[PDB]
Write an enzyme that holds these catalytic residues in place. Sequence first.
Site, PDB file in Angstrom:
ATOM      1  N   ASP A  43       1.766   7.384  10.419  1.00 23.19           N
ATOM      2  CA  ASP A  43       1.677   7.383   8.780  1.00 23.19           C
ATOM      3  C   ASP A  43       0.153   7.833   8.761  1.00 23.19           C
ATOM      4  O   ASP A  43      -0.457   7.943   9.589  1.00 23.19           O
ATOM      5  CB  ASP A  43       2.078   6.216   8.212  1.00 23.19           C
ATOM      6  CG  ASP A  43       2.614   6.255   6.792  1.00 23.19           C
ATOM      7  OD1 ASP A  43       1.655   6.845   5.779  1.00 23.19           O
ATOM      8  OD2 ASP A  43       3.882   6.270   6.728  1.00 23.19           O
ATOM      9  N   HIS A  87       2.463  11.908   4.988  1.00 25.86           N
ATOM     10  CA  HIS A  87       2.005  10.617   5.667  1.00 25.86           C
ATOM     11  C   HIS A  87       1.443  11.266   7.083  1.00 25.86           C
ATOM     12  O   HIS A  87       1.885  10.485   8.115  1.00 25.86           O
ATOM     13  CB  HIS A  87       3.348   9.970   5.750  1.00 25.86           C
ATOM     14  CG  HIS A  87       3.753   9.111   4.603  1.00 25.86           C
ATOM     15  ND1 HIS A  87       3.162   8.221   3.733  1.00 25.86           N
ATOM     16  CD2 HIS A  87       4.871   9.570   3.540  1.00 25.86           C
ATOM     17  CE1 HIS A  87       3.964   7.939   2.843  1.00 25.86           C
ATOM     18  NE2 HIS A  87       4.404   8.733   2.662  1.00 25.86           N
ATOM     19  N   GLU A 136       7.819  12.047   0.097  1.00 26.08           N
ATOM     20  CA  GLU A 136       6.511  11.865  -0.515  1.00 26.08           C
ATOM     21  C   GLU A 136       5.492  12.961  -0.061  1.00 26.08           C
ATOM     22  O   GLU A 136       4.271  12.657  -0.053  1.00 26.08           O
ATOM     23  CB  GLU A 136       5.848  10.588  -0.342  1.00 26.08           C
TER      24      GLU A 136
HETATM   25  C1  LIG Z   1       4.925   4.458  -0.372  1.00 25.21           C
HETATM   26 AS1  LIG Z   1       5.655   3.506   1.247  1.00 25.21          AS
HETATM   27  C2  LIG Z   1       7.733   3.413   0.974  1.00 25.21           C
HETATM   28  O1  LIG Z   1       5.295   4.271   2.681  1.00 25.21           O
HETATM   29  O2  LIG Z   1       5.385   1.718   1.167  1.00 25.21           O
END
Ligand SMILES: C[As](C)(=O)[O-]
Length: 646
Positions: free
Chosen positions: A187, A258, A320
């Site tokens: 991430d 990410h 995202e």
């Molecule tokens: C915004 As998230 C699903 O990586 O906590």
Amino acid sequence: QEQIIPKPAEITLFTGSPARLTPDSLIITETQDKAFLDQAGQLQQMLSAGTGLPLPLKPAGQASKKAACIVIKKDPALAARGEEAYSIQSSPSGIILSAADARGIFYAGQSLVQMMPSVFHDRTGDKSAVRWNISETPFRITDYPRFSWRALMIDEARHFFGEKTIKQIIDQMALLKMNILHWHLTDDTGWRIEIKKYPRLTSIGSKRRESEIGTWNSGKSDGTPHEGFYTQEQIRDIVQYAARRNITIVPEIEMPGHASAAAVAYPFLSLKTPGEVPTTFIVNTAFDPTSEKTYAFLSDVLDEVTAIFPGRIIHIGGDEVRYDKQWKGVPEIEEFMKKNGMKSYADVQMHFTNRMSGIIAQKGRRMMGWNEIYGHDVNGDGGGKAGAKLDTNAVIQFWKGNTSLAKNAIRDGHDVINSLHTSTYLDYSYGSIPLQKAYGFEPVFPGLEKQYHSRVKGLGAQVWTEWISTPERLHYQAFPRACAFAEVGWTPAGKKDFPDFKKRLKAYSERMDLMGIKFARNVISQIDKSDFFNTPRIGTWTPATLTREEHSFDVTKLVKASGKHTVTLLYDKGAHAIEIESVALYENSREVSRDAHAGRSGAHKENIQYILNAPAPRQGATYTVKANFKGAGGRDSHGTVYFETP
Ligand SMILES: C[As](C)(=O)[O-]
């Protein structure tokens, strides 16, 4: 009469004394299949360590009349129920564990544990006086999972926990028959897998200077460096540890969003690489989808992932992608879109996704990703909609949006895992997702035609770790709601029973205590209103009835045999509680039973249940429940009076 979680599919109880393991008990395998013989090995090891009993592996044949033995059979009769199905036949004669596949034997042993005293898990103490009874009577269990995909996700990218903690989690999953470890290992704030070709992924990406704490945009930091990663040797070890416990690991390599840590390690991977590994949880960097070096780098990474992760599914995230902040206006992007006839940034990601899907298939694997890969606007970041269709073979994990979008993907041929985040995100608080909401989760999306139900492979519950820095806080967040999701994934829908689950959770939490799991302790509501949905209502109280202290409710039709009846005085609404003095059972006009203790039923429920002993009914008589209560500081109070039989 036992308390296995998850509740098994089929159980039949017989009268008599239960099977008991003693120092004379044997473990006998009436098959020479190597996979079954192996399961007898670790079953012996596991059972003997827990109980202190020798439990020798003895040849197929003469068991002693002095003690029940465990007999392991390979039985193809449960083949249609799948490779996790098993059967248990338990009596003083013997404890027969049967399965078509060796994996079912391991689950049979986990069930066996949950039918024995919880002191099994105790690391100390004298056990030589424990009676190792298998439940309380003879029984037969036939058991199999409702869903094939019963996943728990652990985020180690946000905070690294390491091998000891993950194996403790795996232990819990195994005991609950959850079979997928979804490992979120990369991430923006961390890269946790060593890649030999690219040492900076860990030498750089696994280090950061400090961590934001409290919540997003808190303005608070801990000022403490955080680092850690897994070596490929450790991953191979954990893979084997989990596989011996019926768990397949699904690694997740986040892309194209990410990706801050990977970019700081090798900055050509992103058009907007940060200056250092982010220290807050609001920085979301995207890979450069227009460059050949991107796909070559990722394909190399997936080669090493393929080599250490045997599972067929490789998760590549996809959630995202902050299109407006990462790609819009960048000349590389806009020229690539013109060059390729793309009208929206969702077309860019779809091009990336479908190219990654082929790279993954060429390595003999199958890609999975969060439902943004399906190509519809999920997050409102200016992405639009994708004109090209997502690779049909791609597995979608649905976490966000109207579930009609999930059903669309299913009807397009996609297999789907339901992770709707308003039910499955274990990093949220217990006010956001109560235990009851986790248990109430139904992975099959409402209004999906039956012909499509086989595309819903199961569920996954997520432990994101932005705000989790210790194992103990991980446990606080993950448990007991993970126990509910284990039951959702395994038990037939028609066998679910939240009040019964809550009672079973009490014994299971003894195991968690002895196993060191710091689960949340005040989250099981002793009484939920829905517990009484199918319980006879015998009356109500209103402001009008609160002008008197004594109240009478007819129960003549409900008193059909001797025994205990529980009256529940359950507040519904109003400014005031009621204060309860006593509840009594009358036969005709005369008292035959009274429970006098102080109760208070309001927003909080204190001892609102009263137990009455009914006599064997007198033919032709009436029976009345009389309850003495009044408004607590006022008469604005509404409630329901329930009458439960054995
Ligand atoms: C915004 As998230 C699903 O990586 O906590």
